[PDB]
Amino acid sequence: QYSPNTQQGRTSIVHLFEWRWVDIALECERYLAPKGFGGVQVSPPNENVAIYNPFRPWWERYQPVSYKLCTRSGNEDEFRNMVTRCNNVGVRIYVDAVINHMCGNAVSAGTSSTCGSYFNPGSRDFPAVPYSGWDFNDGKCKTGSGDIENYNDATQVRDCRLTGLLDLALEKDYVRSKIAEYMNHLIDIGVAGFRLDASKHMWPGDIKAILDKLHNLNSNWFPAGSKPFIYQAVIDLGGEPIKSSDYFGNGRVTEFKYGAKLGTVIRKWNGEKMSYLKNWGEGWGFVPSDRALVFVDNHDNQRGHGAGGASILTFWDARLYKMAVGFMLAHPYGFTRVMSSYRWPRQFQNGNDVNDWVGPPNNNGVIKEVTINPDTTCGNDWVCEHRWRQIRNMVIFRNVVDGQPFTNWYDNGSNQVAFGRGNRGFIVFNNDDWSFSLTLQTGLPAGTYCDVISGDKINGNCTGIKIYVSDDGKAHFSISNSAEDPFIAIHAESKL
């Protein structure tokens, strides 16, 4: 189950949030492949309801109308074209599968859908699938509102509507078959796996029944007998009757405590300090590394929503963000996902962002293409964190040190720490309010290494800082507390 199915050597996937299929295909060939990224998580590719109030929010894509591959990101031809082009270059595609529900019960009937399909939430008729009132949990849910009201009741969380979203009867073989039909369509096209949206709201057993009906991965790109990579979106911060471990039988699970706690530590809140990261991992109560999908932020919580709370680090806090992502990519715990977002007119009022609903850059609803600037950055309001030198070079760092043990740990008892990965990589952080100047044991072969955070190695040259490792593995590091990027990283492949 639990294998990402990426090409040997590639260790991360990127979430190209709300990107168009055609732009992802180009990105795979011009950037992702040559830069060593393992794969891409795409936004839901199935038809959703077009919500005009507010104007085309990002969350309308989490309200299915049918399973036709027709959305603002593109049609089926473009989707197939993207998967093929990306697979041919060694970059995998993972689909965000919204299978727990359909749209909001209070949405008006009609054809306000991304593909014009007709649907009637009131009568619970989605003829494009087709689903009828007999395919929902209206009869199971026993709350007054028909919605989930108490999260300390596991049954309610599974059988009632998540915020009014029509809850599918996943125990019915008919429903399981329709969903499996959709997922097999994607698998045969070439997708390598799925993010199972709202997994906490589904019974582990139903998810299993659906996975039993799936084909093996397309034999043109994957070894025979390959199984799709499955990671279930379960928000478990502890304290609930539902535990992420209840889903280990189906695949990996998203570890939301990861970004929440790392954000608190980097921000140095709640008395937390970087020296405490010495036992980062299961030691902090996270799920086993072999079942974890980790990230600093995701599409939901970077908007202040979702759970980690106010500790979540985002591209808005660029300096601290790069450090957190840098630490995640260097640490052996779990399988890493990098976020790639778009900017929106954030407007707080009483601590809340009233524009947290805003969708991707657009011209009257039409998603704007991702343009690339001369300096390799993106235009049209796409942030492209995956193109930031500090992030992109750490994605490569993880590939280079893959398999190496966590060793040579150092800390000053405060917020200055360093550690290596075998004899293939070393990284140093300074998050204290004073300079860091020290000679440390790196465990690396003697030589001149390019610091990949401040620069790049380009044919025997470094465009940034150079680190000198002596015959005994010692190297001196200097990091001002007022430095742009208060951390340095070198590895086997940045050596001159």
Query: Interface residues with Cl ion (CB under 5 A)?
Result: 233, 254, 298
Closer to Ca ion at the Cβ: 167 or 356?
Answer: 167
Which residues 89-128 are close enough to bind Ca ion by CB under 5 A? 100
Contact partner, 167, from Ca ion, Cl ion, none, Cβ < 5-8 Å per class:
Ca ion
Closer to Ca ion at the Cβ: 98 or 313?
Answer: 98
How far apart are CB 197 and Ca ion at their closest, in Å?
Answer: 11
In the chain, what is the straight-line distance between the N-terminal and C-terminal CA atoms, in Å?
40
Interface with Ca ion, residue 135, by CB under 5 A: no
Is the distance from CB of 205 to CB of 247 less than 8 angstroms?
no
Give the CA distances from residue 187 to residues 2, 219, 341, 386, in Å, rounded to whole numbers and listed in that order.
16, 10, 26, 26
CA distance 126 to 377: 42
Interface with Ca ion, residue 167, by CB under 5 A: yes
Is the distance from CB of 85 to CB of 181 less than 8 angstroms?
no
How far apart are CB 108 and Ca ion at their closest, in Å?
Answer: 23
Closer to Ca ion at the Cβ: 60 or 167?
Answer: 167
How far apart are CB 474 and Cl ion at their closest, in Å?
Answer: 41
CA distance 53 to 359: 12
How far apart are CB 202 and Ca ion at their closest, in Å?
Answer: 5
**Interacting residues of 411 by C-beta distance below 8 A, sequence separation 6+:** 274, 275, 278, 417, 418
Contact partner, 272, from Cl ion, Ca ion, none, Cβ < 5-8 Å per class:
none
CA distance 228 to 188: 11
How far apart are CB 140 and Ca ion at their closest, in Å?
Answer: 9
For residue 163, which amino acid is it? T
CA distance 481 to 432: 7
Interface with Ca ion, residue 161, by CB under 5 A: no
Closer to Ca ion at the Cβ: 202 or 391?
Answer: 202
Tokens for 263, please give them: 């954000």
Is the distance from CB of 95 to CB of 73 less than 8 angstroms?
no
CA distance 229 to 341: 23
Contact partner, 298, from Cl ion, Ca ion, none, Cβ < 5-8 Å per class:
Cl ion
How far apart are CB 445 and Cl ion at their closest, in Å?
Answer: 39
Contact partner, 201, from Cl ion, Ca ion, none, Cβ < 5-8 Å per class:
Ca ion
Closer to Cl ion at the Cβ: 17 or 79?
Answer: 17
Q: Which residue is nearest to Cl ion (CB)?
A: 298
Interface with Ca ion, residue 201, by CB under 5 A: yes
Footprint of Ca ion (CB under 5 A) = 100, 167, 201
